[PDB]
């Protein structure tokens, strides 16, 4: 009975400890997955606006030929 | 059921 | 000992927090400057009201609370309001930009910038406790802060405090005062995330409270101040057992034992009485027998469900004021006869009753009549599942077309997180169905 | 908190100027920049549109831009010309002969860097910049071409801020300029990709209102603008006074834009006389009161924002807004529940005792884009007037891309209009 009385209380610690563990992990994972996903969305936004900046130059550098002829 | 010394 | 820390998240959470702590102060004879002439224990105390209030050398009684919002407007009104002196500034925590009714912003983008500060301030309150009992978290389902940040905090609190109790007062969305089209989304997300981190959650359906204000108090178009003042009375009833004590008093944790048959089935239905105007209450006194009857009238429910079409798993009655055991016992005997009230076959049918002789008070300029006795019934009925169903249907209609989903993805969330949250809700509805079935 | 304003071009600076004229009065701000109001609700959220200079002077956080100086000196010489920060005047000289290409690529690009400098000056000052709102036309060259340039330049520096636009759609009933169907289709191509929310101001509607409804024998530009200012003051009421619903640009977008591309709004106003609550409500949902030439009953409402201003019964407003939804249940999509919201502001607009401003994201807006596309393809099938653009170094493919992309938007509106529940 004494051996069992210890097994029970150590089982309660192990389970409450592991709840803390899982929670701490599941949180850290979805908080990192969020940071990556948002940074990516911003990266692709900035990407599109920077290819409009080089298309804008291909227009300013297309006219610069037409003018001189 | 409500039951006080 | 057995201290309780309140956490008020977002506009709804904060504003309801104002009503509650104002009311608490009136109940304990605490002035808006924190002074309490009754308390002779200067600088300290072991009294029942000390579970919600700490004391200082100056004789100042300070709420064991924290107000958090990602935008300063609402909390600013507290800082400058009637009860400004009641708190210490470190307890009022504001951001600059709110979560724009976006769960993702509340849980991630904006929330992450402030979560550490909040936890640091929560921690500082916990250090004042000789034996912390747990936390009470007030928040809206529909707001970006109320939903997103609340989930984040609750997750963090599970980690930093293990399994100390965490109770919710959650404001369930109603169209009459809804502020966002995506409140169904935010609701399902916060509910899913918090579910395994909450021990017990009292849902407040705004439509129900709106209805009661219109019907019983003849308020033409209820304001937040109207709803809050009624909500506060109900919260006060539930926490009365924690803040007062008498021979007939039953601690809230004892009610909690009866109300939660399984960890997930932790959403009790609240029903409060009497909600009556001063005009109607004049020359008409309501008996223990009368108010007890009201608890089974769905018009007085806090969530719009039908317990008749559902099965009962528990019934608690939190009486306060002029109530004697004799009258209560006879009152329930009547209802046992005059109603049918079906229980599931695996539960007993007794009603756990508590009584606090401290009568209900009312806030000045209030709409509610000051009554001699009042009662709040906490019941665990399968009918509460109706609330999930209405909300899950609203969710389904929009997600089918991925409507508004892009505001969430843009902040970093995934469609998987949506379908996952929705599946948990489907399981919960299923669970609430399973418990109702008869045994073999 | 803070919004930064940008008016660009002839039309942009006209409507922009009137906008400030009007709201300055509502907030009790005189042309010098001093406060002389009665209510404290006026200065509650004044910071949204105004900076507090030394000597308690309120200054419009606004930036004035053009390629010709002809419109801007009229503003500085106007009734309020001195209220503006003189540094925020940024005008070129080479101009733009209503050529979209000159505003976007050529003539506007040398000046774009100088405008952005002023934006940064205002933005760095903001306690909490929520975003920008722009006033411009889509028929011209400066406001249309350079405005769309500016949006793109600002976005890649403030990508997580809200981009709002009051865009004025061109109509033959107001301008004989032939190349407007080109300027619009080219700018709209930019708007769908780079703005979060766009108020469609249709001139066909503004004229028709003025002639048909207001019985103006010959409508002036100021007559059209008196409608625009009433609208703009209406749709920004929730931004400028202490309120609950749509108090900032982001919360509005979240409620109004179910899909990122379909963010083109159909604003409405009542009364349109230039009076009961059931009358206000019916009017603001009527075809005649729409500031875009579209019959909403030819489509379905995705989302709607209603703002009732003035001293009135909130119960009545609630009962009436439920009335119109119930009776017109078919015109609201099923798969977005509770898609209509209602704000109430105590302070009535100047002159009126109570008004109602309407803001709707309807699939009926596709009527407006179809009109432009018919005017566009008719000229473009023949490759007419393309020398003005290709001359500036543009490519004819960029027209097709603009064409096909604008046609996709219409399909998307028709798609969700035909969608069903289960
Ligand atoms: N009963 C009650 N409900 C409220 C109150 N304030 C807001 N709500 C409800 O809360 C929901 C919106 O969430 P809020 O709490 O206002 O938003 P928030 O928590 O501040 O989050 P964000 O503003 O988006 O960052 C709506 O459905 C309202 O009906 C209140 O004072 N009392
Ligand atoms: N409502 C209104 N529309 C205008 C005004 N000025 C120009 N427009 C419209 O704008 C188009 C011409 O663009 P405009 O602003 O003159 O070119 P800009 O020089 O680049 O600014 C035409 O279709 C006009 O109908 C104005 O003051 N009010
Ligand atoms: Mg808020
Ligand atoms: Mg004491």
Give the end-to-end CA distance of chain A in Å, rounded to a whole number: 103
CA distance C259 to C313: 7
Give DSSP secondary structure letters for A6-55. HHHHHHHHHHHHHHHHHHHHHHHHHHHHHHHHHHHHHHHHHHHHHHHHHH
From ligand 3's centre to the CA of C111, what distance in Å?
13
Query: How far is C25 from C53, CA to CA, in rounded Å?
Result: 10
DSSP character for D214? T
How many C-beta atoms lie closer than 10 Å to residue D93's C-beta?
10
Task: Give the domain extent around D390.
Answer: 365-422
Helix, strand or coil, per DSSP, at residue D361: strand
Show which residues of C are catalytic.
254
Q: State the virtual CA torsion across C294, C298, C304, C306 in degrees, nearest 10.
A: 140
Q: Kindly state the tokens that stand for D88.
A: 């925020």
Burial code (b: 16+ CB inside 10 Å, e: under 16) for C48-61 equals: bbbbbbbbeeebbb
Instruction: Give the CB-side neighbour count of residue A21, counting CA atoms within 13 A.
Output: 6
Contact predicate D58/D46, CB 8 Å: yes
Chain D nearest-CA residue for C392: D337
**Burial degree of C344 (CB within 10 A; 0-12, 13-18, 19+):** buried
User: CA-CA distance, D114 to D88, in Å (whole number)?
Assistant: 10
Classify D5 as helix, strand or coil.
strand
Ligand 2: centre distance to CA D152 (Å): 22
The minimal CB distance from A23 to the residues C112, C158, C413 is found for C158
Alpha carbons within 13 angstroms on the beta-carbon side of residue D83 total 27
- For A23-60, letters b (16+ CB in 10 Å) and e give beeebeebbebbeebbeebeeebeeebeebeeebeebe
Domain finish residue from D212, D233, D258: D258
The answer to whether B4 contacts C329, with C-beta atoms less than 8 Å apart, is: no
**φ/ψ (deg, to 5) at D8:** -140, 125
**DSSP string for residues in D150-188:** HHHHHHTTSTTSEEEEEEEE--TTT---TTHHHHHHHHH
Query: Is the same domain home to C410 and C335?
Result: no
Q: Is there a contact between D421 and C400 if contact means CB atoms under 8 Å apart? A: yes
Core vs surface per residue C76-88: b (16+ CB within 10 A) or e: eebeeeebeebbe
Q: Are C62 and C43 within 8 A, CB to CB?
A: no
Asked if D242 and D352 sit in the same domain, the reply is no
Q: Which positions of C make up the binding site for Mg(2+)?
A: 71
Same domain (yes/no): D236, D353: no
Cα separation of D337 and D293, whole Å?
27
Q: Which helix (H) or strand (E) holds D304?
A: strand D301-310
Rounded Cα–Cα distance for residues C54 and D201 (Å): 59
CA separation for the pair A13, A16 (Å, rounded): 5
Residues sharing a CB contact under 8 Å with residue D152, sequence separation 6 or more, in sequence order: A49, A52, D190, D194
Residues D16 and D153 in one domain: yes
Which is it for the CA torsion D55, D56, D57, D60, positive or negative? positive
Tokens of D216: 């103006």
In this structure, are D210 and D348 located in the same domain? no
Domain ranges (residues) in chain A: 1-69
3-class DSSP assignment, residue D120:
helix
| Interatomic CA distance for residues D386 and D364, integer angstroms | 31
Q: How far apart are CA D348 and CA D360, in angstroms?
A: 21
- Alpha carbons within 13 angstroms on the beta-carbon side of residue C256 total 18
Distance CA D142, CA D9 (A): 5
C206 in the same domain as C237? yes
Say if CB D301 and CB D331 are below 8 A apart.
Answer: yes
- C335, C296 contact by CB (below 8 A): yes
Whether D189 and D401 have beta carbons less than 8 Å apart is answered as yes
Which pair of tokens denotes residue C285? 């006194």
Burial annotation C127-153 (CB, 10 A radius, 16+ → b, else e): eebeebbbbbbbbbbbbbbbbbbbbbb
Phi-psi region of C10 (alpha: psi -120 to 50; beta: other; left: phi over 0): left
D211 DSSP assignment: I
Instruction: Tell me which residue of C314, C313, C317, C323 sits closest to C354, measured CA to CA.
Output: C317
Q: Give φ, ψ of D266 to 5 degrees.
A: -110, 90
Whether C249 and C119 map to the same domain: the answer is yes
Query: How far is it, in rounded angstroms, from Cα C185 to Cα C318?
Result: 34
Match 């207001």 to its residue by tokens: D214
How far apart CA D203 and CA D11 sit, in angstroms, is 11
* Helix/strand/coil percentages in chain D, nearest 5: 45, 20, 35
Question: Are D241 and D275 found together in one domain?
Answer: no
CB C292 within 8 A of CB C331: yes
Nearest-angstrom CA–CA distance, C285 and D142: 76
> Residue C203: beta bridge partners?
C170
State the CB neighbour count (10 A cutoff) for residue D338: 19
Q: Is D170 exposed, middle or buried (0-12, 13-18, 19+ CB in 10 A)?
A: buried
CA diameter of chain A: 103
Distance CA C81, CA C79 (A): 6
Task: Report the C-alpha gap between A42 and A37 in whole angstroms.
Answer: 9
CB C319 within 8 A of CB C375: yes
Q: Are C61 and C2 in contact (CB under 8 A)?
A: no
Do residues C178 and C147 touch, judged by C-beta distance below 8 A? no
Q: What gap in Å lies between CA C59 and CA C20, rounded to an integer?
A: 22
CA distances, C127 to each of A17, C122, C130, C161 (Å) = 22, 9, 8, 12
Q: Within this chain, do residues D51 and D91 fall inside the same structural domain, yes or no?
A: yes
Q: Does C156 touch chain A (CB under 8 A)?
A: yes
Q: Are residues C256 and C334 in the same domain?
A: no
Ligand 2 atom nearest to D68, measured from its CA = 19
Tokens (6 digits) for D113: 């860097």
Compute CA D57 distance to the chain's CA centroid, rounded to the nearest angstrom. 27
H or E element, residue D53:
strand D50-53
Q: Which of D236, D310, D321 lies closest to D285 in space, CA to CA?
A: D321
> CA-CA distances (angstroms) from residue C275 to C209, C239, C292, C293?
11, 18, 12, 13
| Helix ranges (DSSP H) in D257-385 | 277-284, 314-327, 366-380
**How far out from the chain centre does Cα C169 lie?**
2
Mapping DSSP to helix (H, G, I), strand (E, B) and coil, where does residue D266 land? strand
C204 touches chain A (CB under 8 A): no
Instruction: Report whether C238 contacts C202 (CB < 8 A).
Output: yes
The answer to whether the CB of C342 falls within 8 A of the CB of C306 is no
d(CA C106, CA C152): 8
Measure the CA–CA gap between C430 and D216, rounded to whole angstroms.
Answer: 65
Whether residues C158 and A34 touch (CB distance < 8 A) is answered with no
Residues D83 and D128 placed together within one structural domain of the fold: yes
| Contact (Cβ atoms closer than 8 angstroms) between residue D267 and residue D273 | no
Return contacts of D349-353, CB within 8 angstroms, 24+ apart. D349/D22, D349/D26, D349/D230, D349/D233, D349/D234, D349/D309, D349/D310, D350/D22, D350/D25, D350/D26, D352/D271, D352/D309, D352/D310, D353/D275, D353/D310, D353/D311
**D143 annotated as a binding-site residue:** yes
Strands C200-205 and C352-356, by their bridges, are: unpaired
Main-chain phi, psi angles of D168, to 5 degrees: -100, 110
Sign of CA dihedral D306, D307, D310, D315: positive
Query: Quick check: bond before C97 cis, omega within 30?
Result: no
Same domain for D229 and D284: no
> Minimal Cα distance from A62: which residue of D?
D393
Q: Are residues D102 and D166 in the same domain?
A: yes
- In this structure, is the dihedral angle defined by the CA atoms of residues D391, D394, D399 and D402, taken in order, positive or negative? negative
D391 to A45: CB separation less than 8 angstroms, yes or no: no
Among D210, D238, D258, identify where a domain stops: D258
Asked if C374 and C237 touch (Cβ cutoff 8 Å), the reply is yes
Q: Do the beta carbons of residue D83 and residue D59 sit within 8 Å? A: yes
**Experimental technique for the deposited model:** X-ray
Nearest CA to ligand 1 atom 25: C99
Rounded to 5°, angle at Cα D226 from D220 and D231: 140
* Boundaries of domain holding C407: 384-440
Annotate chain C with three-state secondary structure.
CCEEEEEEEHHHHHHHHHHHHHHHHHHHCCCCCCECCCCCCCCCCCCHHHHCEEECCCCEEEECEEEEECCHHHHHHHHCCCCHHHCCHHHEEECCCCCCCCHHHHHHHCHHHCHHHHHHHHHHHHCCCCCEEEEEEEEECCCHHHHHHHHHHHHHHHHHHCCCEEEEEEEECCHHHCCCCCHHHHHHHHHHHHHHHCCEEEEEEHHHHHHHHHHHCCCCCCCHHHHHHHHHHHHHHHHHHHHCCCCCCCCHHHHHHHHCCCCCCCCCEEEEECCCCHHHHCCCCCCHHHHHHHCCCHHHECCCCCHHHCCEEEEEEEEEECCCHHHHHHHHHHHHHHCCCCECCCCCCCCEEEEECCCCCCCCCCCCCCCCEEEEEEEEEHHHHHHHHHHHHHHHHHHCCCCCHHHHHCCCCCHHHHHHHHHHHHHHHHHHHHCCCCCC
What is the token pair recorded at D341?
A: 């919201």
Say if residue D385 is in the same domain as residue D304. Answer: no
Q: Which of D397, D364, D395, D232 is nearest to D285 (CA)?
A: D364
B/e letters for C185-211, b = 16+ CB within 10 Å, e = fewer, are: bbbbbbbbbbbbbbbbbbbbbbbbbbb
Joined together, the tokens standing for residue A26 give: 């599941």
Question: How many domains, chain C?
Answer: 3
Tell me, yes or no, whether D273 and D353 share the same domain.
Answer: yes
Q: In terms of Cα–Cα distance, which of C71, C93, C73, C75 is closest to C83? A: C75
CB contact under 8 A, A66 and D391: yes
Rounded to 5, what percent of chain B is helix, strand, coil? Answer: 0, 0, 100
In ligand 2, the atom with minimum distance to the C-alpha of D228 is: 1
What token pair was written down for C300? 């007085």
Resolution in Å equals: 2.3
> Is C303 found in the same domain as C226?
no
Q: Is D420 near chain C, with CB under 8 Å?
A: no
Render D60-91 in DSSP notation, one character per residue.
Answer: E-EEEEESSSTTHHHHHTSTTTTTS-GGGEEE
Q: Domain check: are D61 and D160 in the same one?
A: yes
Token pair 């009503």 is found at: C19
Q: Burial, D48: exposed, middle or buried (Cβ in 10 Å; 0-12, 13-18, 19+)? A: buried
Give the Cβ contact number of residue D174 at 10 Å.
Answer: 19
Phi/psi region, residue D215 (left: phi>0; alpha: psi -120 to 50; beta: rest), is: left
Instruction: Give burial (CB, 10 Å; 0-12/13-18/19+) of D196.
Output: buried
Residues in A touching C159 (Cβ below 8 Å): 20, 23-24, 27
Tokens of C122: 């929560």
Residue with CA nearest ligand 1 atom 9: C12
The answer, yes or no, to whether the previous bond of D271 is cis (omega within 30 of 0) is: yes
Work out the minimum CA distance from C197 to partner chain A, whole angstroms: 9
Among C92, C198, C185, C199, which Cα is nearest to C143's? Answer: C185
Strand-pair category, D2-8 with D62-66: parallel
Q: How far is CA C363 from the centre of its chain?
A: 19
In three-state secondary structure terms, D50 is strand
Kindly report the number of other CB atoms within 10 A of residue D323's CB atom: 13
CA D30/CA C89 separation, integer angstroms: 38
Q: Among residues C24, C26, C20, which one has the least CA distance to residue C7?
A: C20
- Nearest residue in D to A46, CA atom: D156
SS3 at position D265: strand
φ and ψ at residue D160, rounded to 5 degrees: -105, 10
| Token pair for D345 | 């502001």
Q: Residue C49 corresponds to which tokens in the numbers above?
A: 């009201």
Q: Are D225 and D14 in contact (CB under 8 A)?
A: yes
Q: What span, in angstroms and rounded, lies between the C-alpha atoms of C266 and D148?
A: 54
- Specify the residue with its C-alpha closest to ligand 2, atom 17: D140
Of D403, D365, D20, the C-alpha closest to D197 is D365
């Amino acid at each position: 009975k004494r051996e069992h009385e210890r097994e029970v209380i150590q089982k309660a610690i192990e389970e409450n400890n592991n709840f803390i563990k899982m929670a701490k992990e599941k949180l850290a994972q979805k908080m990192e997955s969020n940071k990556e996903n948002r940074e990516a969305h911003l990266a692709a936004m900035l990407e599109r606006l920077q290819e409009k900046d080089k298309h804008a130059e291909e227009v300013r550098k297309n006219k610069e030929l037409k003018e001189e002829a | 059921x409500v039951x006080x010394x | 000992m057995r201290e309780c820390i309140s956490i008020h998240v977002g506009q709804a959470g904060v504003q309801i927090g104002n009503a509650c702590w104002e009311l608490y102060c009136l109940e304990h004879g605490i002035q808006p400057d924190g002074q309490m002439p009754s308390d002779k224990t200067i600088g300290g105390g072991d009294d029942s009201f000390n579970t919600f209030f700490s004391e200082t050398g100056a004789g100042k009684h300070v709420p064991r609370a924290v107000f958090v919002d990602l935008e300063p407007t609402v909390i600013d009104e507290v800082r400058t309001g009637t009860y400004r002196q009641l708190f210490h500034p470190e307890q009022l925590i504001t951001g600059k930009e709110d979560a724009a009714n976006n769960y993702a912003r509340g849980h991630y983008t904006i929330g992450k910038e402030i979560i550490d500060l909040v936890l640091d301030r929560i921690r500082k309150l916990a250090d004042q406790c000789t034996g912390l009992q747990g936390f009470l978290v007030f928040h809206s389902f529909g707001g970006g802060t109320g939903s997103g940040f609340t989930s984040l905090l609750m997750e963090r609190l599970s980690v930093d405090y293990g399994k100390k109790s965490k109770l919710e007062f959650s404001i369930y969305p109603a169209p009459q005062v809804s502020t966002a089209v995506v409140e169904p989304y935010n609701s399902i997300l916060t509910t899913h995330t918090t579910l395994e981190h909450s021990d017990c959650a009292f849902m407040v359906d705004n439509e129900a409270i709106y209805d009661i204000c219109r019907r019983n108090l003849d308020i033409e178009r209820p304001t937040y101040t109207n709803l809050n003042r009624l909500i506060s009375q109900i919260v006060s009833s539930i926490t009365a057992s924690l803040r007062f004590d008498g021979a007939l008093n039953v601690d809230l944790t004892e009610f909690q034992t009866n109300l939660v048959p399984y960890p997930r089935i932790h959403f009790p239905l609240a029903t409060y009485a009497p909600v009556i105007s001063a005009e109607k209450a004049y020359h008409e006194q309501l008996s223990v027998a009368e108010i007890t009857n009201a608890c089974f009238e769905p018009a007085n429910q806090m969530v719009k469900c039908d317990p008749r079409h559902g099965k009962y798993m528990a019934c608690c009655l939190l009486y306060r004021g002029d109530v004697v055991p004799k009258d209560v016992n006879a009152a329930i005997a009547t209802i046992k006869t005059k109603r049918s009230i079906q229980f599931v076959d695996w539960c007993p049918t007794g009603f756990k009753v508590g009584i606090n002789y401290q009568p209900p008070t009312v806030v000045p300029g209030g709409d509610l009549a000051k009554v001699q006795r009042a009662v709040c019934m906490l019941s665990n009925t399968t009918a509460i599942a109706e609330a999930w169903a209405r909300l899950d249907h609203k969710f389904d209609l929009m997600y089918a077309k991925r409507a508004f989903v892009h505001w969430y993805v843009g902040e970093g969330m995934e469609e998987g997180e949506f379908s996952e949250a929705r599946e948990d809700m489907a399981a919960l509805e299923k669970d609430y169905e399973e418990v109702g079935v008869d045994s073999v | 908190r803070e919004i930064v304003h940008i008016q660009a071009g002839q039309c942009g600076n006209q409507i922009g100027a009137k906008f400030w004229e009007v709201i300055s009065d509502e907030h009790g701000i005189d042309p010098t920049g001093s406060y002389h109001g009665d209510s404290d609700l006026q200065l509650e959220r004044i910071n949204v549109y105004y900076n507090e200079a030394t000597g308690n002077k309120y200054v419009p956080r606004a930036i004035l831009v053009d390629l010709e100086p002809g419109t801007m000196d009229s503003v500085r010489s106007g009734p309020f010309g001195q209220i503006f920060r003189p540094d925020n005047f940024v005008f070129g000289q080479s101009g733009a002969g209503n050529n979209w290409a000159k505003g976007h690529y050529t003539e506007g690009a040398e000046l774009v860097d100088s405008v952005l400098d002023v934006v940064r000056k205002e933005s760095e000052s903001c306690d909490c910049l929520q975003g920008f709102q722009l006033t411009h036309s889509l028929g011209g060259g400066t406001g249309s071409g350079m405005g769309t340039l500016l949006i793109s330049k600002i976005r890649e520096e403030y990508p997580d801020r809200i981009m709002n636009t009051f865009s004025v759609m061109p109509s033959p009933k107001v301008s004989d300029t032939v190349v407007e169907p080109y300027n619009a289709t080219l700018s709209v191509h930019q708007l769908v990709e780079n703005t979060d929310e766009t108020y469609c101001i249709d001139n066909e509607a503004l004229y028709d209102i003025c002639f048909r409804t207001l019985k103006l024998t010959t409508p002036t530009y100021g007559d059209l603008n008196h409608l625009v200012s009433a609208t703009m003051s209406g749709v920004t009421t929730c931004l400028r006074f202490p309120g609950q619903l749509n108090a900032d640009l982001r919360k509005l977008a979240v409620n109004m834009v179910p899909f990122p591309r379909l963010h083109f709004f159909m604003p409405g106003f009542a009364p349109l006389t230039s009076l009961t609550v059931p009358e206000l409500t019916q009017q603001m949902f009527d075809s005649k009161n729409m500031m875009a030439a579209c019959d909403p009953r030819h489509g379905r409402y995705l989302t709607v924002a209603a703002i009732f201003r003035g001293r009135m019964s909130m119960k009545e407003v609630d009962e009436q807004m439920l009335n119109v939804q119930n009776k017109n249940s078919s015109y609201f999509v099923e798969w977005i529940p509770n898609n209509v919201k209602t704000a109430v502001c105590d302070i009535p607009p100047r002159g009126l005792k109570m008004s109602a401003t309407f803001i709707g994201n309807s699939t009926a807006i596709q009527e407006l884009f179809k009109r432009i596309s018919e005017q566009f393809t008719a000229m473009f099938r023949r490759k007419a007037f393309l020398h003005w653009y290709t001359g500036e170094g543009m490519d004819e493919m960029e027209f097709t891309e603009a064409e096909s992309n604008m046609n996709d938007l219409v399909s998307e509106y028709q798609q969700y209009q035909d969608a069903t529940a289960d």
